[PDB]
């Protein structure tokens, strides 16, 4: 809200992006646009992505994820408060070695959620889709954390809360940022 | 509504059951109860089940279906107006040779419909359930009509409307009742 | 509402059925049940069906129509107030020579109405269904009135209101009942 | 609501050939009134029927189901307005056997033109307009016959809501007598 | 609610009518019907009308009022609890000398209330109607109470609450019924 | 709905109880009352409990369950349509050897569901309660089916649908009732 | 949301258009206006259209589609997150050789959806319209992908989800943009 | 939405007006104001009116139509996406020879729609009004297309969809703008 | 909506006021303020008031009307689209000789509309008010048009639609502005 | 509301106003203001005024961990009410620089939440919120000097404290007199 530029525009000048909400299509379109703009300004300097998010749309999250992996600058990820669901997926997506959480930040991982209505045939199509989406997410999370796909699958069957230290041990982040 | 007994109680005295609504658990509980009662009164005399129904719950319909096949009396089925979805399934369930439709009655067959909300795992469970339910329905309908399961599957992919004459050719009924 | 039996049960004792509402599945189930009961009581005496109805479901109306043509007794139809849409179709369905309207009663004929929502394929299925239903209705109305199918089609494209005298000239009734 | 020795109060009065029209006139009300008229005639085709009318009006076609049944059956139907006969209620009041149409002294009668609605294409609005205008002509012609007023006077006097005292209703020809105590 | 007949049917056997609600068309229909029935049973014995009512429709109240004045039996009126607006008008309408209130019963008189919506011309018609209705009510109340029309007009401009004793002094009742 | 007694009262005369709805406190109150009454009429003759139910309240179901085990008569259970959740628990509760399902009836088992809201302390109390309730249900189901508690726990983690034949192999019923 | 110009206005300076929402008339009016403006600024430099969209109105999508094909500059299309329904149609509409998806982006194709209410005649008109619209879409998609119209028809009967790699095989895009 | 001026203000600098929504009084006020302003800036240079509109108010559309015919500059009309109802009327209103549609744009023509409530007299007034409005529209459309008034009347009785090529053959536009 | 100033502010620079909506208190306050401002800028140059309005509040309209008659500059009125009810009253209020309508613009005149709810006395007060307001409007309209008050009264009893040419012959405008 | 807006003008003097419930948007703004103030000057004190009924635990921890992360001392000043997570953040200011005005109110209590679904899911939610309560109690114990046992007992129900009681408790260091 405050003016200095608004406060977030002022931090964007220093290559800081604030992801502080649910991840929907509008949020992703803004974050992607900020990433593309920061890269056009300087393709060498690190970007800093702060993440306080309960999660959101899988496809919106993948728009952000693929943009992070596409652009030349390293994107550091810093979890403050909560990175849950697609929020923890994006936290794990930062440049390897530059993924952080503050000491009391919380990380939560779980499987995708959705809904389906209609004919048996359509419910089948929706089920196959969301199951294939879960496999895609598990494969990527396996690669970013070093855990096996089997372990990822087991650990996301239900809501799984992790402390910052547990998130580091898991491979979701690299360091807990001490004061 | 009118009194003679109410009009439907008066027809139940003559072993006539009127199924004239959507099939839910309360409707099934009444129809099943009327079938059990008619059998306890006389285990040999035919029962007459008039069907004007847009369909309804698969399990409620199977409560009626299995009761028809369980009891000793033959249950004749007479379609007036419309037998759609589970209504056409119950029409096909009458005693072989005693399944009828009036000349302008309409029959409609299609696949089950449902919904599923939650985790990928739960959507998978719901999808497998409704697909297995569709196979159960197709196998039984194949047995009652003489059509192959593959033909039943094709012919129910979308809403399939049949005239009374087409319903007889299909094997859903035995005779069109002429005036 | 009043008691004598309720007033309609008292008239049913004299083989009078009152159709005084929209035609839905519950109304059709009651009327069909009253017709079957009157026939079981006496298969030769006339039945009298008074019709004051704005219309309703096509399949519910056909449950009544096919029952009229099925049973042995003649069913006289008497229009009081309004027979519109499926109400005028059932008025035309009485025993030939025994279809009446009171002098200020109104008759209205028009084409079926419906709705369709979903994929192009499903909208196509619904369109073919309602068009085939319109052809079925026109063919029957042509046979009951003596008008050609082409004329019926033309005269039902929009709401077409007829006086009792016009309804007699049209062939929808046989006589205007004078005082 | 109350019960008499077993009858509800209206069923008890129907035994004496009294029908109570005490509500809006819709299809269910007309169905009941028509059924009571047919039943009273089947019981005795010669004795008068008494139709009390306290009604704000209602559906034109429902009212005509009642009107044509009154004119069809052999018994005379007396009409007695208590409280209000408005719109189709005043039309049915005027429909009683000539000489046997009454209102109590403080009863109110109101006459006006039909009301409706139309929605859709220009063509459909045209069809609905022609229908309701033809219905108004039908109502005016009948009311002209029942009251002795000209159709042009009926048309003028129903352009807007027109309230009449019982005495004015008698002078108009809508009733024959104000029933004094 | 209780059965002894329901409780009100049992009191109707003793020529007691209970007016214990808002006066609308259904209430008036019932009260008028009870009055006509009591007169047909015995045209010479008094009727007792208990009144606990907040008022209601003017025309519904006049259906009751004119029926009271029409029938041969005297109708005593007994106010218990409250007779307000059209309720106090009907209380004043009992047989002169036989209008009562219990000692703590409340009587309220005021002018008619209504609404009008539409063209200036229609609002004018509605205004003239309700003003003429107020004059009719004042003239009758003047003759039942002995007060002048001017005084009635002045005393009903706003809600005017009266004790039972004040109602007797006003002429609305004849006696306060002591224990 | 129909009268012969209503249809269910007529079957209660033959010691048949119809459980055809969701199990809440009113349903349990009625079923318990019917069981107590049937026992008071004859403490030696079998009772027949038909079950078509999606489930319901655990405590309402236990009111029925404990009443079944308390009374002297054997209670046969017959699944028609659907016995799900507490419905399948009550199906398994019939007299051993007298638990049935019709061939197309469906059985579903799963773990309890609930909600909790308030302070951490209150959420803890609610969690311990529902977990202890699940252990109680598993222990009883283990006794009634012969499966181990561990297997019951694994098989109820998610919605688990069983055919009638699968329900018999599981130990939930004793026989599939063939036609 | 952020200011640098808003972030999207800043990217429009570099000939980047962000389509990140459902496609309705307002979205199309903006995109068309941005295309016309970019062409007026420079008729030879490429335009970049990022697409993250669940789809939307067919006619709104065709306003965008025909504008792309009208203007002189090549329009590259880049799918991030999701291009579904009309979104995947516009993705396929980019300059041939310049249609991209990021590796985890999702593409979905299916047939048009709509609704129709009214007379049989009007439902027929609406059905013919949406079927002709589907043929128009299939013909164009056939041209843009190289698949036959029959294959397009078969592959869009139900929701058909494609990975980026599958979308390239299909001909909807030319390249998956690797990091 | 985007900034350069907003995108539409930037195109207005080049004498381009974007009509991309329903036509109501606010839309007409804006379009009329833009037309008057463009004429005041230069009374000779062409104006370009892009039309993507489902239609709207007849009087709002005539405010735009009469302003087009009043001002000195030619107004070219370009249909993108859909010009339906009053949208197709305004498309036909462009300077003769300068009325265009893009190849996949859709044109729809039909008769006016409205509603009327109240007294018979008021419904008559509303009916005469909308019928006279339809004649006014048909006369003008006849003049702009070269079709007879009777053909216009027949072709607008129901929703009539036209391709761009059909719209040119009809006389609603002069050219389909090829790429 | 568009910027050049917004489009309406740009036209206000040329002494053009756009009345393109319902007339309520906020609209009147703005129009009055624009009139006062234009007069303060130049007390001799004409003002141009475009009117496309369905009408609105009588007192809001009189705030505008009295301001027009108060200020020194002539106010030309130009009807585009529709001037109905208070909109046609303000159209008639322009400087005599400078009141215009475009050829297809519609003018409608009728009597005031309102509502009243409460005691008879209050309904009387409201009726007298709206009738006196109608007389005030008729007297002014009589002066502005040259028609007698009795003709104005007859011609406004119901909705009265006029073409531009009819409005000129009536005296509501002076000229139809041809192209 | 008034005009910089009034809060932007105070941010120029390193004053942050936390005057609402603490949700994710509020935390994102406060965190952003803290990061910005530190980037402007990593030495000068920041002043955080707190009038808040509380809010989300994780949103509050985003603010809390940012306070402890940055180099500048963050003074906390309670005006009106610091309740629940608001009182937790008040206790989080630089030791010696935690204040309340004399009539300000402080309230402490345990976390609140909800859980719907299977027994297994209710168990997961219960363990989560209980572990969150332990985390909050441990931190509050360190910031106040009270034992974890005492914190647990004093937060079982809503516990209202005057400013003076809050100082005695260790939630603040000083009551700011006029
Ligand atoms: B989460 O942030 O809650 C989660 C993300 C993954 C990492 C666990 N989000 C969802 O599950 C949201 N669901 C969807 O985007 C979705 C996906 C699919 Cl494939 C189908 C429907 C829905 Cl709604
Ligand atoms: B129909 O009558 O419309 C149809 C029955 C078969 C014969 C096509 N009804 C349904 O499919 C109703 N659906 C279910 O009973 C159902 C609902 C849900 Cl949420 C999940 C599974 C099932 Cl099987
Ligand atoms: B009418 O009573 O208004 C009319 C009947 C015919 C005689 C004109 N009723 C309907 O058209 C109601 N429509 C349907 O019952 C129907 C039929 C079909 Cl085939 C498809 C959809 C619907 Cl909704
Ligand atoms: B009144 O009883 O209120 C009146 C009857 C006549 C005597 C004035 N009722 C109506 O005008 C309404 N009744 C209709 O039957 C009607 C409704 C509609 Cl929407 C259209 C036409 C008709 Cl004719
Ligand atoms: B009272 O019961 O509250 C009162 C009657 C008094 C004056 C005796 N009732 C009403 O005023 C109720 N109003 C009407 O019945 C009415 C009358 C008229 Cl004339 C017009 C409209 C209405 Cl709504
Ligand atoms: B089922 O009938 O759907 C199921 C019981 C099965 C698992 C035997 N029902 C429920 O879980 C319904 N839940 C409760 O009655 C309940 C139980 C407890 Cl212990 C706490 C809360 C609730 Cl809401
Ligand atoms: B999609 O984006 O979901 C889809 C477009 C095609 C490419 C599959 N959208 C629609 O089908 C939306 N439907 C329409 O625009 C439409 C609606 C109606 Cl009622 C009638 C016709 C059409 Cl063409
Ligand atoms: B359309 O754009 O959907 C259509 C335009 C004509 C050219 C086919 N619009 C309408 O018909 C909207 N109707 C009106 O503006 C209108 C006109 C009249 Cl004269 C009376 C009522 C209404 Cl609502
Ligand atoms: B019209 O704009 O629809 C019309 C104005 C006259 C010229 C016909 N509007 C109204 O009548 C709106 N009504 C009022 O402003 C009004 C006036 C009075 Cl006196 C009392 C109540 C109301 Cl609501
Ligand atoms: B308070 O601000 O009201 C309180 C904070 C603590 C210090 C007492 N807030 C809450 O308890 C709000 N609850 C949550 O943030 C929460 C936490 C957990 Cl672990 C689970 C669910 C919820 Cl909703």
TrEMBL record, chains A, B, C, E, F, G, H, I:
Q: Which GO terms describe its biological process?
A: protein quality control for misfolded or incompletely synthesized proteins
Q: Provide the E.C. number(s) assigned to this enzyme.
A: 3.4.21.92
From what organism does this protein derive? Staphylococcus epidermidis
Q: What is the annotated role of this protein in its UniProt record?
A: Cleaves peptides in various proteins in a process that requires ATP hydrolysis. Has a chymotrypsin-like activity. Plays a major role in the degradation of misfolded proteins.
Listed GO MF terms: ATP-dependent peptidase activity; ATPase binding; identical protein binding; serine-type endopeptidase activity
Protein name as catalogued: ATP-dependent Clp protease proteolytic subunit
Question: Is Nucleus among the key words of this record?
Answer: no
Keywords of the record, alphabetical order, are: Cytoplasm, Hydrolase, Protease, Serine protease
What family is reported? Belongs to the peptidase S14 family.
Listed under GO cellular component are:
cytoplasm; endopeptidase Clp complex
Class in the EC hierarchy, top level: hydrolase
Instruction: Tell me the compartments it is located in.
Output: Cytoplasm
Per the record, what are the reactions this protein catalyses?
Hydrolysis of proteins to small peptides in the presence of ATP and magnesium. alpha-casein is the usual test substrate. In the absence of ATP, only oligopeptides shorter than five residues are hydrolyzed (such as succinyl-Leu-Tyr-|-NHMec, and Leu-Tyr-Leu-|-Tyr-Trp, in which cleavage of the -Tyr-|-Leu- and -Tyr-|-Trp bonds also occurs)
Kindly give the NCBIfam families that the UniProt entry links to this protein: clpP, PRK00277.1, PRK12553.1
Q: What residue range is the signal peptide?
A: none
Active site feature:
85, 110
The answer, when asked if Protease is one of the entry's keywords, is yes
Q: How does it assemble?
A: Fourteen ClpP subunits assemble into 2 heptameric rings which stack back to back to give a disk-like structure with a central cavity, resembling the structure of eukaryotic proteasomes.
UniProtKB/TrEMBL annotation, chain J:
CDD domains, alphabetically? S14_ClpP_2 (cd07017)
Keyword tags = Cytoplasm, Hydrolase, Protease, Serine protease
Q: Which reaction does it catalyse?
A: Hydrolysis of proteins to small peptides in the presence of ATP and magnesium. alpha-casein is the usual test substrate. In the absence of ATP, only oligopeptides shorter than five residues are hydrolyzed (such as succinyl-Leu-Tyr-|-NHMec, and Leu-Tyr-Leu-|-Tyr-Trp, in which cleavage of the -Tyr-|-Leu- and -Tyr-|-Trp bonds also occurs)
Quote the InterPro entries the UniProt record gives: ClpP (IPR001907), ClpP/crotonase-like_dom_sf (IPR029045), ClpP/TepA (IPR023562), ClpP_His_AS (IPR033135), ClpP_Ser_AS (IPR018215)
Q: Name one GO biological process term.
A: protein quality control for misfolded or incompletely synthesized proteins
Q: Name one GO molecular function term.
A: ATPase binding
> Where along the chain is the active site annotated?
84, 109
Q: Which GO terms describe its cellular component?
A: cytoplasm; endopeptidase Clp complex
Q: What EC number(s) are associated with this protein in UniProt?
A: 3.4.21.92
Tell me where in or outside the cell this protein is found. Cytoplasm
Q: What is its main location?
A: cytoplasm
Q: Transmembrane region positions?
A: none
* Subunit relationships: Fourteen ClpP subunits assemble into 2 heptameric rings which stack back to back to give a disk-like structure with a central cavity, resembling the structure of eukaryotic proteasomes.
| Stated role | Cleaves peptides in various proteins in a process that requires ATP hydrolysis. Has a chymotrypsin-like activity. Plays a major role in the degradation of misfolded proteins.
Similarity comment: family membership? Belongs to the peptidase S14 family.
What name appears for this protein in its UniProt entry?
ATP-dependent Clp protease proteolytic subunit
According to the entry, what is the taxonomic lineage of the organism? Answer: Bacteria, Bacillati, Bacillota, Bacilli, Bacillales
